[PDB]
Amino acid sequence: SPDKLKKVLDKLRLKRKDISEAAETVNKVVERLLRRMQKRESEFKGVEQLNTGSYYEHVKISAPNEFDVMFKLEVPRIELQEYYETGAFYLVKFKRIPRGNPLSHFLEGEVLSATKMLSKFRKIIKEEVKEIKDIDVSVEKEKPGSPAVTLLIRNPEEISVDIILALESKGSWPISTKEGLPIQGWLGTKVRTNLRREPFYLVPKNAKDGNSFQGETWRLSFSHTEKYILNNHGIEKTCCESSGAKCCRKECLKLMKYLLEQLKKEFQELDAFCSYHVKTAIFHMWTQDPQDSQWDPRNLSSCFDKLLAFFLECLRTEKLDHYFIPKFNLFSQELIDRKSKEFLSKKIEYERNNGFPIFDKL
């Protein structure tokens, strides 16, 4: 018979079925909205959905009726200024644009104001969504401190869709990423070169650090690159394809994400942890153990355990480098209290030694 891990994987997959019709309504609405926004004359006319993946391995931890989508907007001629030395935050300035900067009126001094740009973004979405007549779509009351523009869809049960604006820049990647994406021994040098020729994204995010520059800071996003890696994750090109062999790489990611999700429900001490920490850890593990034969499906329980051990060691050393931005320590004392990491370590060790009873629930 199958062990608990395989049962949990089966159950996780079957959950996709309960979310499918809502997911379809979401795509319907988003696509209508994008068309309306693309028809209209505004600084957001060029907006498009950035595809980041929708399966459990790709998305953040969420309620079954909560969705997130990123709307990307190409912004030519950005001059980036590192705001944090780690590369955690940036200010957005501009180089010379002889024909005129189309985002000119979103500037505050030399810097692009996320506050001004999001305010207009919110206003336009609210106006267009009012024109959707066949399905009840409104905009949730703005949550001070949250940049998402949240759609509420009622058909007739309520679905929430957080819309996140992402600036698209086609310039070379920021200097803070120079040693990031360490995939040379795994996906290799040509893939790394190709991936780094793609755009990078900037998403509005406030730092929690005083009044100066609030509403003017952005963090980098590589959601596109991350999707690509998740779906092209083998040293062999045929990994998980029909004329290749399956590996257990995504299964380990899913198990570890679900472990954290279930733990986060039980213990609000774990509020500062998110699925991105898990995805980051596993990117590092995929780099350390690049061979597809080091992720054989036969070895699921051993591979999951070596991922736990790795994550536990990141917790113990208080260090988990962003995979794209090596100086950005996601497990710094300032982002996550030492006592929270010690608490999570203790919970993980407990689960690992008792056959994962937290997976026994619904």
Residues that bind Zn ion (CB under 5 A): 234, 239-240, 247
Q: Which is nearer to Zn ion, 202 or 247 (CB)?
A: 247
Of 239 and 335, CB closest to Zn ion: 239
Kindly tell me the burial class for residue 215, based on how many C-beta atoms sit within 10 Å of its own C-beta (0-12, 13-18, 19 or more): middle
For the CB of residue 239, give the shortest distance to Zn ion in the complex, in Å: 4
Question: Is the CB of 230 or the CB of 247 nearer to Zn ion?
Answer: 247
Q: Judged by CB, which is closer to Zn ion: 172, or 232?
A: 232
| 257 is known to lie in a ligand binding site | yes
Q: What angle do CA 198, 42, 78 make, to 5 degrees?
A: 35
Element housing 324 (H / E)? none
Does 137 show up as a binding residue in the annotation?
A: no
Burial (0-12, 13-18, 19+ Cβ within 10 Å), 196: middle
> In angstroms, what is the minimal distance from the CB of 218 to Zn ion?
34
Q: Which is nearer to Zn ion, 5 or 315 (CB)?
A: 5
274 annotated ligand binder: no
**Between residues 125 and 247, which has the closer beta carbon with respect to Zn ion?**
247
Q: Is 225 annotated as a binding residue?
A: yes
CB of 234 to Zn ion, least distance (A): 5
Q: Is the dihedral of CA 123, 126, 129, 130 positive or negative?
A: negative
DSSP-assigned letters across all residues of 3-23 = -HHHHHHHHHHHHHHHHHHHH
105 known member of a binding site? no
**C-alpha angle 72-206-145 in degrees, rounded to nearest 5:** 95
Known binding residue 233? Answer is yes
Smallest distance, Zn ion to C-beta of residue 280, A: 19
Instruction: Let me know: does 132 contact 189? Beta carbons within 8 Å.
Output: no
Q: Is there a binding annotation on residue 219?
A: yes
CA atoms of 102 and 202, how far apart (whole Å) = 17
Contact between 143 and 122 under an 8 Å Cβ cutoff? The reply is no
* Least separation in angstroms between CB 248 and Zn ion: 8
On whether 322 is known to bind a ligand per the annotation, the reply is no
- To the question of whether residue 226 is assigned a binding role by annotation, the answer is yes
Whole-number minimum distance, CB 313 to Zn ion, in Å?
Answer: 25
301 is in an annotated binding site: no
Angle made by CA atoms 157, 51, 225, in degrees to the nearest 5 = 140
Contact 220, 325 (CB under 8 A): yes
Q: Are strands 66-74 and 158-169 parallel, antiparallel or unpaired?
A: parallel
Give min distance, CB of 282 to Zn ion, in A: 13
Q: Beta-strand (E) ranges in 263-354?
A: none
In the chain, the amino acid numbered 280 is T
User: Tokens 């931890």 sit at which residue?
Assistant: 61
Q: Supply the minimum distance, in Å, between the C-beta of residue 302 and Zn ion.
A: 16
**Helix, strand or coil, per DSSP, at residue 226:** helix
Closer to Zn ion at the Cβ: 204 or 234? 234
Query: Are the CB atoms for 88 and 219 separated by under 8 Å?
Result: yes
C-beta of 20 vs 291, nearer to Zn ion: 291
Residue ranges of the annotated binding site are 52, 54, 66, 68, 145, 162, 205, 219-226, 233, 239-240, 247, 257, 275-279
